[PDB]
């Protein structure tokens, strides 16, 4: 029962962005203001992309804390018979639903419910101030999402397709087969899935009618553009009728383009103004092509003061793994920290040569990638990462280039751990861990994006029998014969690997990071060159091994399914270094000070280069070979081979899993600042590092459209209620 529950004393931290914001000029602040607003508007779309009840839950809480702040509500809640412990349980839950934009954890895809009796919360909500101003709206909301807010039925606990899970990227009656069928339909029409959803309905006959709905401001009405309009029709695909519609998240996206236009007025240069014009095109029409062209302009704007990106980008939470979750961020460049990353780019092309795979599997042309350290002012969406490689359009990654980003002030929050909190470690390891995990993470994050995601060439064939590579000269180094597999027209990385695409690529990126972290030159770029360099390496690997063990929390044993892509990647890497044997990694079941079941992680420092590196190189070379040729069947057999969780000796993971769950530590919530505009001045509003502080950060997040946004999210959820 500890699962599906956010602990009262869950950690909360705020972002250090006060100083970064002060550096900006009066115009750049107006540029960052509207971009941030656009992001937060679009962030609400995640509610519709999470759970059926998430829009209702957000709207219900947004009405509560609008009338009564967390301290005003406290007096009311305690007067109704709730203990202070039970009230804090509600604040944490609300702060949870806010920081994830849904009642499911973005990192774990797990449902969480309030930690208090259902009837006690009913008394608080139905007896509140917002319930006496708009009783019709409040009581309605409570009768709609009341049971679902607390219901922990097995089918509701996790995100997923079929009867066994919950997802709003699809309808309730959808299964994996419907997703694969729809995917082939999209590849054949050359229509991207990044901003689409799939709905399978049935007529009075029982014959399933599939509907693909693109996300856009404009609806069924005709517009000027025809690149999307000429696709809005009915189809006949393998005996199954397909309909391509749009207008998804229309009122929300309408608010988004409003702020994108206003931001274009304060645009720095021409590229920033053209990319926003295309983003407006993509959100108004529903054109990923418009987004692709906008992203193309975005890569051209190198070293900007106010970096930004927005749209349906990442596909982690899509059960099939091709549909994008809406996000967007505004950040100020940290020219101080970014000095360490541009020297890495200076020798980046060099480091790509010492990678395990032959130079025929690397991008033929190496464009200089823009790598900058950023201080985040705003990151809308489900959660916040440490670093990002963008865009995810593979054709752009080998044409115009790409941008690497390390979030400076986000790493600052992560750089916080107590000695007793560190689990599955020996006492002598704890010291080196605390001392070096900070610098070691910068090492990993840098290689993860630049030389990890930023490397690798995909084999593509055009309409004619011509390839972007010489067919007669390229040899598969794992087979011996020439290449017999490639990406056809319209096929992308995600469309072919689907349900493991996200995990597979991060694992390839993670392994690259570990691999190239052994290079004394790379460490010199950050500045270590010595025994301190040796320690960073040991920590970078010990962290990886320990993460692999901790990853067992995000595995569901009954469905044989991984819920988090990055953690599945590290468990794979963990098993790769256990397959290598030679006493490199050992996991031993022990007993802690409290007497509860425990475990220990031991890693041999001297055998990292003699046993670890060659084992990782073999694994690293196989990954890229199967990615470039696009060999799914083999790619799956390899990755899902090491991603298999069984309690086979000597590790016995299923038994260790309970130990991990028993002693697990929830990740901390993050409070983000706000920007307010009075006359011509742009001020920065900061908040408390608390649950109540986080709630206040959202109550003042929409000053104008408070009541209106709650109205939009409500009716948008009401229309599609039939699907679930
Ligand atoms: Mg389902
Ligand atoms: Zn990554």
Numbering used by the authors: 3 to 726
What does the paper say about this structure?
Human dipeptidyl peptidase III (hDPP III), also known as enkephalinase B, is a member of the M49 family of zinc dependent metallopeptidases and cleaves dipeptides sequentially from the N-terminus of various bioactive peptide substrates. Crystal structures have so far been determined for DPP III from humans as well as from Saccharomyces cerevisiae. Despite the low sequence identity (36%) shared by the two proteins, both structures are very similar and consist of two lobes separated by a wide cleft. The “upper” lobe is mostly α-helical and contains the zinc binding site as well as the catalytically important residues. In both structures, two histidine residues (His-450 and His-455 in the human enzyme) and a glutamate (Glu-508) coordinate the zinc ion.
We also determined the structure of the unbound enzyme in the closed conformation. As a serendipitous result of the co-crystallization trials we also determined the structure of the unbound enzyme in the closed conformation. As yet, structural studies on human and yeast DPP III in the absence of ligands have always yielded an open extended conformation. Because the crystals in this study were obtained through seeding with microcrystals of an hDPP III ligand complex, it is very likely that this procedure induced crystallization of the protein in the closed conformation.
